[PDB]
Amino acid sequence: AEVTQLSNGIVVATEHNPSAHTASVGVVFGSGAANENPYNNGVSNLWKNIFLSKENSAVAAKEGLALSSNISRDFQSYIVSSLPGSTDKSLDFLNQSFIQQKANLLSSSNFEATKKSVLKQVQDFEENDHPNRVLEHLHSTAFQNTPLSLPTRGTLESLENLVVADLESFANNHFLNSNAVVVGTGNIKHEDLVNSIESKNLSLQTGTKPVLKKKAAFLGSEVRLRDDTLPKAWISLAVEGEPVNSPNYFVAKLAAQIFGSYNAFEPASRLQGIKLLDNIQEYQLCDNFNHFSLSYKDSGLWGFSTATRNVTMIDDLIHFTLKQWNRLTISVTDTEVERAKSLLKLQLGQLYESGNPVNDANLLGAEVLIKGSKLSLGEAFKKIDAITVKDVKAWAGKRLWDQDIAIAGTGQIEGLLDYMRIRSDMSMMRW
Amino acid sequence: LTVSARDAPTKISTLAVKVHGGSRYATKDGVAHLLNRFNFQNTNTRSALKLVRESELLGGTFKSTLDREYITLKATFLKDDLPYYVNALADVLYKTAFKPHELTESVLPAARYDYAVAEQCPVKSAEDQLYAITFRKGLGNPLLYDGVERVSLQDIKDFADKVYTKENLEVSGENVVEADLKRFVDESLLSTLPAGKSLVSKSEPKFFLGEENRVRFIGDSVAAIGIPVNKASLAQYEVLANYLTSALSELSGLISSAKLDKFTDGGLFTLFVRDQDSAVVSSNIKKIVADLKKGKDLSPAINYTKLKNAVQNESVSSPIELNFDAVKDFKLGKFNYVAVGDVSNLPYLDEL
Amino acid sequence: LTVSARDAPTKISTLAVKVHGGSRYATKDGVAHLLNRFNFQNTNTRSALKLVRESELLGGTFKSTLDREYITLKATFLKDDLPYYVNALADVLYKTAFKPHELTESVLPAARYDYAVAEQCPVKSAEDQLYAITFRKGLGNPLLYDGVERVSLQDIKDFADKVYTKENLEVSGENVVEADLKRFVDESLLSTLPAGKSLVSKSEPKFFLGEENRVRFIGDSVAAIGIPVNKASLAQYEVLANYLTSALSELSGLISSAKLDKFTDGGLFTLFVRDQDSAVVSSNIKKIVADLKKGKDLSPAINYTKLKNAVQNESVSSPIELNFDAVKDFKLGKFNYVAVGDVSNLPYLDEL
Amino acid sequence: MAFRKSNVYLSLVNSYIIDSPQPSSINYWWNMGSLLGLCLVIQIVTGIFMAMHYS
Amino acid sequence: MAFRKSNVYLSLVNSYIIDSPQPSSINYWWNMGSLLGLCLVIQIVTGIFMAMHYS
Amino acid sequence: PQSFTSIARIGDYILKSPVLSKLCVPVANQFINLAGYKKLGLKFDDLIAEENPIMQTALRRLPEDESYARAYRIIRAHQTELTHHLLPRNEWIKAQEDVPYLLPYILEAEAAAKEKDELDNIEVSK
Ligand code: HEM
Ligand code: HEM
Ligand code: HEM
Ligand SMILES: COc1c(O)c(C)c(C/C=C(/C)CC/C=C(\C)CC/C=C(\C)CC/C=C(\C)CC/C=C(\C)CCC=C(C)C)c(O)c1OC
Ligand SMILES: COc1c(O)c(C)c(C/C=C(\C)CC/C=C(\C)CC/C=C(\C)CC/C=C(\C)CC/C=C(\C)CCC=C(C)C)c(O)c1OC
């Protein structure tokens, strides 16, 4: 279904869907937050809000277009959505407002107003959004002094020094033809999209992006943002995971599905077939947890995030969850693998097969900037079905058994023990 | 008993059963909220635990949602388990156990959590009073259950006997073969339900204009206005909501939210201004009201609102058919007003 | 600084200092409640503990009371200890410490208890709602502190300096030699207070008619009505209050309470119906308002009212003299209405 | 909870030599108490085995 | 609090001897435990005083 | 520690057999009278040991009026035994009053716990 062409440097990829009632086109760059330095951190956040500025978005509304933009560790995207048949105007808007003319957007009183608003967006994120600011400090401590440790939103201290001249430097170095993929999702044909691009000039810059000296490397460490005025405790814990282009990519994803997510206030969440639940329910140890498996270009992270009000029994929560991770190496059963297979296929079919062409454009553009193509959903189901119990035990013994960990936390975390007591739980002396 | 489906070459399927049993049909305060939190408990043939464990090994999930018009039972599953999930939903509407200890241990604690979450938001509070003062006993019924009116286990059983009838529900599906769905809907326990009557009333509801209400609250101050809308002027207020929260308007920076909730007999237009400081809330609401009284031209926003309406209608299966081709102007007349927060520093209706 | 007293052959004396610093003069919500709870704390020359211990060995007690018009400081003691309690009251109005640790340890927790025991009574909640919708700012100001508006220690200090002035207080005593009281007040710290300005205005308070409000509540249901009264009609509504509650009226068995609150420039009439069943409350209030709209003859209740007036004016040293002799009939016009409790089963204003 | 905290006998061991919260600044002079415990064990065991041959 | 409950050593005596909640219907067969503790004290005290004269 | 599901299964087979019912039920009635718990004002369902999760669930779901009455019978039995006497003959529990009031709650809690153990040890075929 995915069709990918090449044209003088830029790559065109589409995912046609006749039943859609909305087409979407845009450009996805293969550079993100991991391509900055601790002094220009936050440049890609300013470029996102300049694109969605009031004057820029007022022009788009008259033609009937809506704008979106996303910033990640590896990629950033700029999307224009419109009704089918209006795809010609969306390409025209992208050309003369972001690709070829950035002077009007980068004017004074428009850069000074956007910078004022972003400085407020990160001030309240740093003091109101606790679960998402300990997952950001987990990246900061696990990849310290490496490119994979800078926050995607930037830093408050770093954003007060950025000027308009720093935004032109980043655009000249990264917004290039060799670093870009042109995407189209929804009700739009591959032949029509490529014909429109060649009917115009539609050429980005010519240079190549700079290369990074050092790669990302995991380091076992911890950071503690203790605050005794907050009513809860938020904790994130992870080991080194898998990159995107790995043979164990789906095996690590299936492993996180065995433990899954949990909500204490949902009656149906308390009946899940997870052996961890019967340990943490007699005494209410947590309100919620989720197990993740994040992959990037260089490395990844595998672990869980928790939030609890039972501040006197945090040690019990950590001890029981890590003891269930040990069974992935020694005694994982066949019923647990079959259940996690069915729930992973449903979860994948709800992310790639949603009804939002904007979500599809980000997913499709990011997978082509890394491996030059997109793996279909039918082929991934065949790879998930092939996983066996011996595969899980081999992967867990290599990545989980007796390995270093990274910890982040905030709130009332006096009851969280030291690093060595927690690291002792990654293995059993009885085995 | 209406059955319809749309087909597609995909992996995941969706099945929904919509019942005309929302908060606007509740006989007692919050009895519809309590029936929502009993929808996937034990039945007379299968336990709640057994259903959760069995569907996990097949690749599916369940959910139930409540609003002021509908109670919706939804199932998301893999495309080949269709007959299993038809009967699971048929058993819910037919033979729910309604045990005395299920209400005490699972249903009531779940309802307390929902009420406590919505109470902490001042915008949800201001919207509830706007529905209460505009429509008094119809759409103005409380959505959630708070224990002000006593509701017993027999009350919930009685309410289910009235809304779970063959003439009061519709069945819809996405990425589902329609011929196969019709076969499975028959030869099922849905076909043996009582054939009652449709609770839908076609006449326009009674509304009230020029009302006011104030609530003291610790947190953020909120000022809101509300306007009842008839069936023939839904498109005019659909353009106005998108225009007021877009880059085409200078008031969009002072507005926190604005929407039009649509029903089969009319709608309600809502506009909210929210800030931590009550001096900004008082100043912003005065500028918005004065500007809307002079009048606005909504023709530039017609094309924008055509695309936004397409985004929302992709998920919905029975949206309201609108035109937008004849919307020209707007001038504010009469409206209702609610102030939540530090009310001693917020304006009254006569001062706006 | 007006001093007055009456003598008697009695072993116990009382001394009161009335200040025009009630909740209707408050700059912030609950700032008068916090100053009232801060009254008999440490002063700059003496501690709170020392005052209690020393006064107990002399036979005396202290008390501070707050209403919508006054803040009153009262001392009950043995007759011969008069000069001790004149200086003790003068020191409170002059050199209160206002320590930051006294607000968090003693004053704030005491105000939380007063608010907690008043939010559980539906009659007190309904009366405050009636004051709010009749008069908006001023007499309609909240009585107690609930933390909706942030009040700091500097705000309490500023409020005290505004109200504790020489021209804003009156001194009165019971069983006190008037000649001796004037000499003690003259040479105390009261005579060195700032000579500010009187906060009482000679005009009439703006009021509103035809208003309504509903509050949800778990417990007993209450329905109430409110009528603003000017200076010329004060005697007519005083007879009406006593006629409705006494045995001369058939409606007395349906009325829970009824009273007239009298100020210098007017008053407010209140009537309450309260029961645990909402149906009983609904039927009673409808019958009350239909009977009063036809009219009443308040002549048989004049002599009864004269006795009741003299009973409650026995303690008050400045009672306004009412006539009661020219009161003939009553006819209900426009009024305010408040419903508290099971509001989904209580009548609206337009149905009364 | 963990078996080391719920058991009647293990909870006395856990509360005294496992989970006991100690200050992080105590030096080697705070080690003489544990040495006195080893001295008392040494004296009791050697005395008992010697008492089997003593008159 | 009473001194018998705040003291470190008296609390153990109070919780086992003074304030221990007992069922009201336990008969005289429940008196053998306290007798067995008197037998142990009798044996130990008499044995030690005899051991001062034993070879 | 025999489950009440096992007791009921064996007991029913005796009651549905006409031959066994006429030879076993008369013995059981004399067995109960000689036990003598009715002379202390107790029903049999008050004698079941309660220090397990199954019986703590059943006692939680018992209605208030039944729960208040049970607490009075238990307190009265402790004080009667304290004095080494019996209750007056007119206060004894009758045979028609000795009904299994708690048994349906026990069986319902036992069936739920067994189905949970059979689903934790589930094995998916094909
Ligand atoms: C067999 C004899 C003794 C044993 C087994 C013993 C045991 C202990 C232990 C294990 C500690 C805690 C660890 C430490 O502080 O090093 C301690 C602390 C202490 N001991 Fe001893 N002890 C004994 C004799 C004594 C004597 C004779 C004294 C004083 C005359 C004493 C006074 C103290 C004090 C004051 C502390 C607390 C000091 C501090 O923590 O700063 N003990 N003891
Ligand atoms: C804290 C415990 C103890 C201390 C400090 C202690 C101290 C001593 C000392 C200083 C001597 C003199 C030995 C010599 O100078 O050669 C001695 C001798 C002796 N002790 Fe202990 N003792 C202790 C415990 C015990 C116990 C528990 C026993 C028997 C159960 C015991 C049995 C003996 C015997 C049999 C001797 C004979 C003399 C010898 O063997 O050297 N001791 N003890
Ligand atoms: C020197 C030896 C012993 C002493 C000092 C002792 C002491 C006690 C005491 C004081 C009690 C509580 C009061 C009572 O029930 O009488 C008790 C209860 C008990 N003892 Fe012992 N005991 C000893 C030996 C034993 C033995 C050998 C057994 C069993 C083989 C045993 C089993 C029990 C049991 C089961 C209870 C609880 C009975 C109940 O409360 O219903 N004890 N013991
Ligand atoms: C590091 O943490 C610790 C810590 O671990 C310890 C132990 C202590 C010490 C604490 C104590 C309370 C001391 C413990 C010891 C005692 C109270 C006394 C010890 C008692 C004995 C040694 C008696 C045991 C005697 C025997 C087994 C007799 C031997 C004879 C035999 C076996 C005869 C042979 C048998 C036959 C059949 C022929 C600490 O102070 C401490 O710091 C906090
Ligand atoms: C709480 O319920 C109970 C209960 O549980 C128990 C066990 C008992 C019964 C027993 C006890 C409480 C005591 C338990 C016994 C022991 C722990 C045994 C310990 C041994 C002793 C107390 C005796 C020790 C004696 C000596 C060391 C004295 C030796 C003689 C000497 C030193 C004299 C020589 C002097 C010189 C100068 C040479 C109860 O009575 C009771 O009801 C209150």
CATH number at residue B201: 3.30.830.10
Other beta carbons within 10 angstroms of residue B261's beta carbon come to 16
CA distances from F100 to D5, F48, F104 (A): 40, 11, 8
Of B305, B228, B311, B307, nearest to B270 (Cα)?
A: B228
Of E23, B314, B115, nearest to A83 (Cα)?
A: B314
Q: B308: which 2 tokens?
A: 């936004």
Is residue A244 classed as helix, strand or coil in its secondary structure?
coil
Is B140 in contact with B29 (CB distance < 8 Å)?
no
Of B346, B219, B345, B129, nearest to C148 (Cα)?
A: B219
Give the amino acid at A395. Answer: W
Ligand nearest to the CA of D41: 4
* CB-CB neighbors (< 8 A) of A64 in chain B: 303-304, 306-307
Which amino acid residue places its CA nearest to atom 10 of ligand 4? D37
User: Chain centroid to CA B201: how far?
Assistant: 18
Residue whose token pair is 């006395």: D12
Residues C58 and C194 in one domain: yes
Residues C204 and C232 in one domain: no
Residues C266 and C284 in one domain: yes
Other beta carbons within 10 angstroms of residue C174's beta carbon come to 17
Is C260 in contact with C242 (CB distance < 8 Å)?
no
Query: Measured from the CB, is residue D48 less than 6 Å from ligand 4?
Result: yes
Q: Which residues have a Cβ under 8 Å from the Cβ of A84 and sit 6 or more positions away?
A: A20, A21, A22, A23, A186, A187, A188
CA distances from B203 to B23, B264, B266 (A): 18, 10, 10
Q: Does C53 touch chain B (CB under 8 A)?
A: no
Q: Of the candidates B211, B241, B256, which is a domain's last residue?
A: B211
Q: What would the DSSP string read from start to end of B190-215? A: TTTS---------SPPP---S-EEEE
C104: which DSSP letter? I
What is the CATH topology of the domain spanning A1-202?
Answer: Cytochrome Bc1 Complex; Chain A, domain 1 (3.30.830)
Give the strand order in the sheet containing C336-341.
C212-216, C336-341, C221-229, C267-275, C257-262
Q: A416: which 2 tokens?
A: 């969280």
Residues B131 and B3 in one domain: yes
Residues C349 and C261 in one domain: yes
* Pairwise CA distance, residues A367 & A352, whole Å: 12
Is residue B131 classed as helix, strand or coil in its secondary structure?
helix
Residues B207 and B251 in one domain: no
* Pairwise CA distance, residues A331 & A327, whole Å: 5
* Pairwise CA distance, residues A197 & A63, whole Å: 19
* Pairwise CA distance, residues F19 & F14, whole Å: 9
Nearest-10 Cα torsion for B188, B190, B193, B197 = -150
Determine, for residues A335 and F123 on separate chains, whether the beta-carbon distance falls below 8 Å.
yes
**Which ranges of chain C does DSSP label H, i.e. alpha helix?**
31-37, 48-56, 82-92, 100-102, 108-118, 122-134, 153-163, 178-186, 234-245, 278-294, 302-312
Query: Measured from the CB, is residue E17 less than 6 Å from ligand 3?
Result: no
Secondary structure in 3-state letters for chain E:
CCHHHHCHHHHHHHHHHHCCCCCCCCCHHHHHHHHHHHHHHHHHHHHHHHHCCCC
Residues B157 and B287 in one domain: no
Is A75 in contact with A32 (CB distance < 8 Å)?
yes
Of A282, A304, C327, nearest to F56 (Cα)?
A: A282
Instruction: Provide residues with CB under 6 Å of ligand 1.
Output: D 30, 32-34, 36-37, 40
Is A29 in contact with A209 (CB distance < 8 Å)?
no
Q: What would the DSSP string read from start to end of A29-97? A: ES--GGGS-TTTTTHHHHHHHHHT-HHHHHHHHHHT-EEEEEE-SS-EEEEEEE-TT-HHHHHHHHIII
Q: Does A283 touch chain D (CB under 8 A)?
A: yes
Q: Resolution for this model in angstroms, one decimal place?
A: 2.4
**Strands A406-411, A221-226: pairing kind:** parallel
User: Chain centroid to CA A367: how far?
Assistant: 13
Ligand nearest to the CA of D16: 4
**Strands C329-330, A288-295: pairing kind:** unpaired
The structure was resolved experimentally with cryo-EM
Which amino acid residue places its CA nearest to atom 9 of ligand 1? D33
Q: Which residues pair with A225 in a beta bridge?
A: A410
Other beta carbons within 10 angstroms of residue A125's beta carbon come to 15
B296: which DSSP letter? E
Is residue D24 classed as helix, strand or coil in its secondary structure?
coil
Q: B160: which 2 tokens?
A: 């289910």
User: Binding site annotation covers D16?
Assistant: yes
Is residue C339 classed as helix, strand or coil in its secondary structure?
strand
Q: How close is the nearest chain A Cα to the Cα of B48, in Å? A: 8
Determine, for residues A313 and D2 on separate chains, whether the beta-carbon distance falls below 8 Å.
no
Angle separating helix axes A43-51 and A111-128, nearest 10 degrees: 120
Provide the greatest CA pair distance for chain A.
70
Q: Does B158 touch chain C (CB under 8 A)?
A: no
Q: Where in chain A is the domain with CATH 3.30.830.10?
A: 1-202, 208-431
Q: Which residues have a Cβ under 8 Å from the Cβ of A217 and sit 6 or more positions away?
A: A143, A146, A299
Other beta carbons within 10 angstroms of residue A119's beta carbon come to 14
Q: Does B208 touch chain C (CB under 8 A)?
A: no
Determine, for residues F119 and A273 on separate chains, whether the beta-carbon distance falls below 8 Å.
yes
For B323, the domain range is 218-352
For F124, the domain range is 1-126
Ligand nearest to the CA of D54: 2
Is B78 in contact with B56 (CB distance < 8 Å)?
no
* Pairwise CA distance, residues A286 & A277, whole Å: 10
* Pairwise CA distance, residues A165 & A158, whole Å: 15
* Pairwise CA distance, residues A105 & A107, whole Å: 6
* Pairwise CA distance, residues F36 & F33, whole Å: 6
CA distances from C331 to C252, C268, C292, C293, F99 (A): 18, 16, 6, 6, 68
Query: Measured from the CB, is residue D47 less than 6 Å from ligand 2?
Result: yes
* Pairwise CA distance, residues C82 & C182, whole Å: 11
Give the strand order in the sheet containing B221-229.
B212-216, B336-341, B221-229, B267-275, B257-262
Residues B149 and B265 in one domain: no
Other beta carbons within 10 angstroms of residue A255's beta carbon come to 27
Is A299 in contact with A243 (CB distance < 8 Å)?
yes
Q: Return the exposure string of C18-34: e unless at least 16 CB atoms fall within 10 Å of the residue's CB, then b.
A: bbbbbbbbbebbbbbbb
On the 0-12 / 13-18 / 19+ scale of CB atoms within 10 A, A332 is buried
Q: Which residues pair with C272 in a beta bridge?
A: C224, C257
* Pairwise CA distance, residues A157 & D54, whole Å: 81
Of A59, A69, A53, nearest to A106 (Cα)?
A: A53
Q: Of the candidates C187, C211, C235, which is a domain's last residue?
A: C211
Q: Of the candidates B162, B185, B211, which is a domain's last residue?
A: B211
* Pairwise CA distance, residues B278 & B282, whole Å: 6
Of C330, C271, C273, C32, nearest to C158 (Cα)?
A: C32
List, in sequence order, every beta strand (DSSP E) within chain F.
Answer: none
* Pairwise CA distance, residues C339 & B340, whole Å: 19
Q: Return the exposure string of A48-74: e unless at least 16 CB atoms fall within 10 Å of the residue's CB, then b.
A: bebbebeebbeebbebbbbbbbbbbbb
Give the amino acid at C272. Answer: F
Is B292 in contact with B255 (CB distance < 8 Å)?
no
C319: which DSSP letter? P
* Pairwise CA distance, residues C267 & C237, whole Å: 9
Other beta carbons within 10 angstroms of residue A422's beta carbon come to 18
Q: Does B316 touch chain C (CB under 8 A)?
A: no
On the 0-12 / 13-18 / 19+ scale of CB atoms within 10 A, A218 is buried
Residues C238 and C206 in one domain: no
Residues C189 and C250 in one domain: no
Find chains touching chain A: ≥3 CB pairs under 8 Å.
B, D, F
Residues C116 and C46 in one domain: yes
Is residue F62 classed as helix, strand or coil in its secondary structure?
coil
Q: Does B143 touch chain A (CB under 8 A)?
A: no
* Pairwise CA distance, residues A307 & A319, whole Å: 15
Q: Which residues have a Cβ under 8 Å from the Cβ of B341 and sit 6 or more positions away?
A: B122, B215, B216, B217, B219, B220, B221, B222, B278, B281, C148
Q: Radius of gyration (Cα) for chain A, nearest Å?
A: 23
Other beta carbons within 10 angstroms of residue C74's beta carbon come to 15
Is residue B125 classed as helix, strand or coil in its secondary structure?
helix
Q: Which residues have a Cβ under 8 Å from the Cβ of B173 and sit 6 or more positions away?
A: B4, B5, B6, B13, B14, B15, B16, B181
Q: A316: which 2 tokens?
A: 């019990």
Q: A25: which 2 tokens?
A: 């086109």
Residue whose token pair is 């290369």: A211
* CB-CB neighbors (< 8 A) of A20 in chain B: 314
* Pairwise CA distance, residues B315 & A359, whole Å: 14
Give the amino acid at B253. Answer: G
CA distances from A43 to A21, A39, A210, C245 (A): 35, 10, 16, 76
Question: Of how many residues is chain F composed?
Answer: 126
Q: What would the DSSP string read from start to end of A270-331? A: GG-S-TTHHHHTTTT--SEEEEEEEE-SS-EEEEEEEEES-TT-HHHHHHHHHHHHHHHHHT
Architecture of domain A208-431: 2-Layer Sandwich (3.30)
Determine, for residues B57 and F61 on separate chains, whether the beta-carbon distance falls below 8 Å.
no
Q: What would the DSSP string read from start to end of A173-214? A: HHSBGGGEEEEEEES--HHHHHHHHHHS----B-S-PPPPSS
Of A361, A393, A316, nearest to A17 (Cα)?
A: A361
Structural domain total, chain B: 2
Give the amino acid at F69. Answer: A
* Pairwise CA distance, residues C2 & B205, whole Å: 64
Select from F115, F117, F120, F126 the residue whose CB has the most chain A CBs within 10 Å, as the one to mutate to test that interface.
F120
Other beta carbons within 10 angstroms of residue C291's beta carbon come to 15
Residues B180 and B238 in one domain: no
Touch criterion met for B and C (3+ Cβ pairs within 8 Å): yes
What value, to the nearest 5°, has the Cα angle with vertex B226 and ends B221 and B230? 165
Task: For chain A, report the end-to-end CA distance as a whole number of angstroms.
Answer: 49
Find chains touching chain F: ≥3 CB pairs under 8 Å.
A, B, E
Determine, for residues B148 and C218 on separate chains, whether the beta-carbon distance falls below 8 Å.
yes
Structural domain total, chain F: 1
Is A30 in contact with A74 (CB distance < 8 Å)?
yes
Question: Of how many residues is chain D composed?
Answer: 55
Determine, for residues A335 and F119 on separate chains, whether the beta-carbon distance falls below 8 Å.
no
Touch criterion met for E and F (3+ Cβ pairs within 8 Å): yes
Question: Of how many residues is chain E composed?
Answer: 55
